[PDB]
Write a protein that binds this ligand. Structure first.
Ligand SMILES: Nc1ncnc2c1ncn2[C@@H]1O[C@H](COP(=O)(O)OP(=O)(O)OP(=O)(O)O)[C@@H](O)[C@H]1O
Ligand SMILES: Nc1ncnc2c1ncn2[C@@H]1O[C@H](COP(=O)(O)OP(=O)(O)OP(=O)(O)O)[C@@H](O)[C@H]1O
Lengths: 969, 158, 110, 206
């Protein structure tokens, strides 16, 4: 960016000394850098690299922060620094195979950085060729990251990189120049370039110090989120070399950097390997002719001083064994890290499995806890599953400090981080849960519930599923997870994060449905107890409450839940009781003591009259009698006289209905409850009914406005009567079709729009053609809208529109011929100028309206019915629980007698309870069924054709490896 | 803009019906009829602007190849024809009849106006796909009507 | 017949309406903000005087790089999905069994 | 010789495409069309070096008709000669991917009308459907990533296709599948409501 020259410098020579010793630091001046930005290798259609010309004395912290943050490079899990490189464009074939199959493949698998010279020559060229060859024969894997630390002064055509304003699309000439032994181009297989300018031109070796300092600084950084992980492993791979390479190895060893020396390469690599395996001067003489023996011998002695940092890549070792060798080079350097933490730092679960399975070592609890913390922080569900399947105490592992660290691993841009910051006006997960799920729904020993909550809040699907599979209250925890995810998906600023949360919530709802199906197939009574018990983990909420809050329609739609709801609906009676038997007992109370009703004196009486179905029947009878009384008062007893006994009884009955509605609104903060009540359409209709009743009664009691009161009460009777549909929504037969009816209103509105346009056109045309003489405004509106509307229902007044059916009379003074239509609301005189067109318009109107529009509406209704059938059925099944609960919560009396019970409720102002033993037994039974379900699912997945084919491919690969081993000898 | 044009077209239809049912007399046109003339002129100018802003011959062929623009052209042409007939002293009733049919042609353009609307659009375009069924119904009905009507007229011998 | 035709042409009619929605919105955007008969005012203006974004070079370059990143991710995902299908797994298994047969023949020769 | 696998393998191997494609080489590439092909007929008509610019002008009209790696030139060449695999490769290696997919769909649909052979027109229409699907998939990816940047990509003018926006290219190409995806429809709704919020109630507007 524009801040790079302010903090990064370049060195320009000032003091001139002829070719008395030119100091790189004393005879040079540092100025704001002019070469930085991105590289486009002109002609090649590749991505742009990131390049920076930086001074020799540049601290590694600044460049590392530039790479990781500004340039968008992920921090490496490993850094391999490749050194040496024998002269010659052709490498040995086995060495090329090692660079491609061993180094680049391991770097891609472990997410490492390959650091070498970035120039298109020597070991840099060979590593670039390895990267290119690996990418050519590559899968859809992440690209390898390559860094080139090269001198500024040997970079060919580097003048094109100089732009003080920032050479971001810097076009670089990388080919076409004659090959020279002084300047070399930049190899485009490298992701980034650090051009270390020490002030010279054409001199090699001025960048080694910065490269070593950068490697050492990277060795001190931490892997994973935050600084929690291990130090980043930095390994130096040495191929061939010379005396300067011996100096490089000595400096790296003094800097505590492991060095892997490739056996069979040549000088400075086979020399050190032979010295290491020998554990004297002839080898130095043969590897390094024309080299002074004393200094080289002393340097080799200083090399062998720290011989624990040297490892040998023997010729026996294959490429596929690269990573393991790196491991044995890193841990040997440690003797902090272990093989498990390295396997977690990389994404290699196979290495972790191999390390855990080996019996020579005995991993202790502190190794496993460190690896588990790394896996949890870095979102590695496979590692946590593998480490918990291996022996480990989870109660001892999860300390409050560790849980705080786990919650502090959320991204700063995440919703959970925002909620935790709000609650902190240790984490405040309890406050976040309280503010999310309200209360009475919001949540040593293995804390699977704590880990499940943590994984749900941070939206980690696989770990959340694992922690659910390892928990205890499985059905309730699945419903609570679904509820929490659906709640948090609303507060998501990102639509894709909300989609992810909703997907996870659907998965958890499906898990709950499957487990409850298993349990209910096992036992209905225990499944019902599990469904109706209160889970202390979720605020003593039952599974039905959690499903209702989560809108989990798939959970309500399964047969066990529906049958339990039916059983609760029938109360203390048998669910198989016939409806006619219920009616007979309702109208003949003593019959409840006969064989008619199979229950499951005073107690029996309250059992019968307290069941929700009996209360529903009583309220249905009461509402029918209320409508009968309303019609009797409206059609007979309503007179301008003062109200009589029946009208006052109707007033009292409407008052009790209003009191019941008020009680339901209260028992459903005051403002929030009122807004909830007024947001419901059917409660809006009921409020309109009661308001119109009050308005009509007030008008009637006023001496002036009696007829207005009659009219208002006549419409109010319709509003009251249409609430029978809402009453019977709970009914099993009528409910789904009643809710289907509401989905036809779009088709109805389309029909009405088309019909209104056609009515306007046809009616105005016919009225204009006929020219009635009695053209009052109501008469015009009638003949334009009402008469054509009735023509759709078989009311076709031919005598009022067809002049041939009228008597021709001279009833108009205007010129022309006129006829007299006999209809009362016709114009009493119409024109006969173009009456054939009136007849033709009637024909066309009948065709368009009675045939085309009606049949089109039928087709639309059929399509919509077929489309919304299943979703309406699911919605009705979901709302059945709320309807049954509401009918259970209401008084056993019916209006107008409910006032009695209301007075009681004014004077005094669906669950099971299990003992600890019974609850423990029920939870163990549920866990057994969950483990059986998980085992069955795993077996089904393993025995599928996809997994069989995958295992066959893996075993054929193993057979190919063994066949190659046989073929070698 | 869509809402404003919908309101304007509804008021134009209201004015058209008011002039057609009340203010249309063999007398010279009144203030409301002249206002209707001006409103139809502005509608024609808007249609011309849309046709221009859509070579001259190729643009005209494009305009005349669209069915709804054909309907709108028929509406404006019938309005002009009816006004011309009415202004002629002889052909007043013919002008009334032409303008009565022209009102229907104008009114049925509410469907084309509301094609853009989200709720009505897909069903409006579905409606145009039912004309083959309508034509089959009309053909079968016409054959049956001819047979039955001629047989009944022959039997009754009025 | 109406029911059959409605069910048959539902989806294609919906697609057609979605396609023409852009042209309808563009046409309503291009017309004067006045309504008839007042449009004549604006028409006089149009007789007297006779849906896009503009990005700087930096913003355009950033947007094109972002699009290229998403295209490369999409292509990589498609390649991974194709490679991990059962057809390609079976094909690779057949090829590797052929290679194993070749190596077994080489072993059997000596 | 129409060997897409070879060109993919040789470009994956190091090679500078800007240095490779010279005007003589592009002329040779266009002179490799069959004498019976539609593109040969159009080039002969435009010659009353090739005249690919004139052919594009006469095909896509104007304001829609189209050193460094010339992926756009190779894509145009492969689209004109109706080479499906190489056209797809050159699209995958290009830059203005969504607009180039829509423009490829438009050009193929335009050229499929001028095809004397019904099977060649069917091939062009199949390739146009494939390109439209590629554009739909890429815009879906981009819109799931970011709605604002996806809208800017949809509403910007592509100088490669005559400063035409993606919506204009889709309308000209009759690309109904591109208009039918949720991001395009929501952008259209946002443009419909103008400087107001798309969630504004209708009663509030009244
Ligand atoms: N009594 C036991 N029965 C079975 N497995 C055990 C038992 N005690 C420990 N383990 C298992 O042995 C492994 C290593 O634990 P080990 O007994 O070696 O040390 P530790 O006491 O857990 O740890 P530390 O060395 O920190 O005290 C773990 O997988 C642990 O679960
Ligand atoms: N600076 C570079 N970085 C990376 N790869 C390069 C570089 N220069 C050339 N290559 C690659 O090396 C390969 C062969 O090119 P090489 O360098 O051998 O010769 P050239 O300069 O391209 O050709 P010529 O011999 O015609 O001058 C090609 O794949 C090319 O892309």
């Amino acid at each position: 960016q524009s801040w790079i020259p302010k903090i990064f410098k370049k060195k320009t020579c000032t003091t001139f000394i002829v070719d008395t010793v030119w100091d790189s630091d004393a005879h040079t001046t540092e100025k704001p850098t002019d070469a930085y930005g991105e590289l486009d290798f002109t002609g090649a259609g590749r991505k742009h690299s990131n390049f920076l010309r930086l001074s020799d004395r540049t601290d590694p912290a600044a460049v590392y922060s530039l790479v990781t943050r500004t340039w968008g490079f992920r921090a490496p899990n490993l850094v391999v620094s490749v050194l040496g490189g024998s002269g010659g464009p052709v490498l040995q074939t086995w060495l090329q195979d090692l660079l491609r199959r061993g180094l680049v493949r391991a770097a891609q698998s472990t997410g490492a950085w390959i650091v070498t010279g970035g120039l298109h020559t020597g070991i840099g060229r060979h590593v670039g060729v390895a990267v290119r060859d690996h990418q050519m024969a590559s899968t859809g894997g992440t690209k390898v990251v390559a860094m080139g630390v090269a001198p500024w002064g040997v970079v060919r055509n580097r003048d094109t990189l100089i732009n003080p304003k920032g050479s971001f699309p810097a076009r670089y000439r990388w080919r076409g120049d004659p090959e020279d032994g002084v300047q070399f181009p930049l190899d485009y297989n490298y992701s980034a370039f650090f051009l270390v300018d020490d002030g010279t031109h054409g001199c090699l070796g001025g960048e080694n110090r910065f490269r070593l300092r950068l490697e050492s600084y990277i060795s001190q950084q931490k892997t994973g989120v935050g600084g929690t992980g291990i130090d980043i492993p930095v390994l130096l791979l040495l191929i061939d070399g010379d005396e300067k390479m011996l100096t490089r190895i000595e400096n790296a060893t003094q800097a505590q950097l492991p060095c892997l020396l490739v056996a069979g390469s040549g000088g400075a690599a086979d020399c050190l390997a032979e010295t290491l395996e020998d554990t004297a001067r002839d080898r130095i003489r043969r590897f390094f002719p024309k080299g002074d023996l004393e200094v080289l011998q002393a340097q080799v002695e200083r090399i062998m001083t720290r011989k624990e940092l040297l490892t040998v890549y023997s010729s026996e070792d294959g490429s596929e064994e690269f990573e393991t060798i790196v491991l044995k080079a890193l841990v040997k350097a440690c003797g902090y890290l272990d093989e498990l933490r390295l396997a977690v730092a990389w994404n290699r679960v196979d290495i972790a499995q191999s390390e855990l399975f080996r019996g020579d070592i005995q991993w202790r609890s502190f190794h496993l806890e460190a690896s588990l913390m790394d896996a949890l922080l870095n979102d590695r569900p496979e590692f946590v599953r593998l480490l918990i399947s291996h022996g480990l105490s989870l109660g001892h592992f999860l300390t409050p400090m560790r849980l705080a660290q786990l919650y502090s691993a959320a991204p700063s841009n995440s919703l959970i981080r925002n909620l935790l910051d709000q609650a902190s006006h240790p984490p405040d997960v309890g406050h976040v849960l309280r503010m999310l799920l309200g209360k009475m729904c919001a949540p040593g020993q293995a804390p699977w519930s704590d880990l499940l909550l943590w994984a749900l809040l941070l939206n980690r699907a696989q770990m959340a599923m694992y922690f659910w599979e390892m928990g205890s209250n499985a059905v309730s925890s699945a419903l609570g997870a679904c509820l929490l995810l659906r709640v948090m998906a609303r507060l998501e600023p990102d639509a894709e994060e909300a989609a992810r949360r909703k997907d996870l919530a659907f998965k958890f709802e499906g898990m709950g449905v499957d487990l409850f199906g298993e349990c209910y197939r096992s036992s209905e009574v225990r499944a019902a107890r599990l469904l109706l018990r209160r889970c202390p983990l979720w605020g003593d909420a039952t599974c039905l409450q959690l499903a209702m809050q989560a809108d989990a329609r798939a959970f309500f739609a399964q047969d066990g839940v529906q049958s339990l709801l039916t059983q609760k609906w029938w109360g203390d009676m048998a669910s198989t009781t016939p409806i006619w038997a219920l009616v007979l007992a309702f109208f003949c109370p003593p019959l409840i003591y006969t064989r008619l009703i199979t229950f499951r004196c005073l107690r029996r009486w309250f059992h019968f009259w307290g069941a929700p179905v009996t209360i529903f029947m009583g309220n249905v009878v009461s509402y029918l009698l209320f409508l009968l009384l309303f019609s009797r008062v409206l059609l007979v007893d309503f007179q301008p006289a003062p109200p009589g006994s029946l009208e006052l009884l109707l007033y009292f009955w409407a008052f009790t209905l209003l009191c019941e509605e008020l009680r339901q609104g209260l028992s459903g903060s005051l403002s929030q409850r009122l807004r909830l009540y007024l947001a419901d359409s059917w409660n809006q209709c009921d409020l309109v009914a009661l308001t119109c009743f009050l308005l009509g009664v007030g008008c009637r009691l006023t001496p002036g406005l009696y007829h207005l009161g009659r009219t208002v009460l006549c419409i109010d009777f319709m509003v009251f009567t249409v609430r029978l549909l809402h009453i019977f929504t709970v009914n099993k037969q009528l409910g789904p079709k009643i809710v289907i009816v509401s989905k036809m209103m779009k088709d109805v509105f389309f029909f009405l729009f088309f019909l209104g346009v056609w009515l306007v056109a046809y009616g105005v045309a016919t009225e204009g053609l006929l020219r009635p003489r009695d053209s009052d405004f109501p008469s015009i509106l009638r003949r334009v809208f009402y008469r054509p509307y009735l023509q759709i229902f078989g009311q076709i007044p031919q005598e009022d529109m067809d002049v041939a059916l009228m008597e021709h009379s001279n009833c108009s003074s205007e010129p022309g011929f006129w006829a007299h239509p006999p209809g009362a609301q016709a114009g009493t005189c119409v024109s006969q100028y173009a009456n054939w067109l009136v007849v033709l318009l009637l024909v066309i109107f009948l065709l368009v309206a009675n045939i085309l529009l009606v049949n089109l509406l039928i087709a639309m209704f059929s399509y919509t019915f077929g489309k919304v059938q299943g979703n309406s059925d699911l919605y009705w099944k979901a709302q059945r629980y709320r309807l049954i609960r509401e009918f259970h919560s209401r008084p056993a009396l019916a209006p107008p007698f409910i006032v009695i019970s209301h007075l009681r409720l004014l004077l005094r102002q669906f669950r099971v309870y299990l003992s600890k033993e019974a609850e423990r037994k029920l939870l163990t039974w549920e866990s057994v069924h969950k483990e059986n379900f998980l085992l069955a699912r795993a077996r089904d997945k393993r025995e599928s054709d996809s997994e069989r084919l995958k295992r066959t491919s893996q075993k054929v690969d193993l057979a190919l490896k063994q066949l190659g081993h046989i073929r070698e000898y």
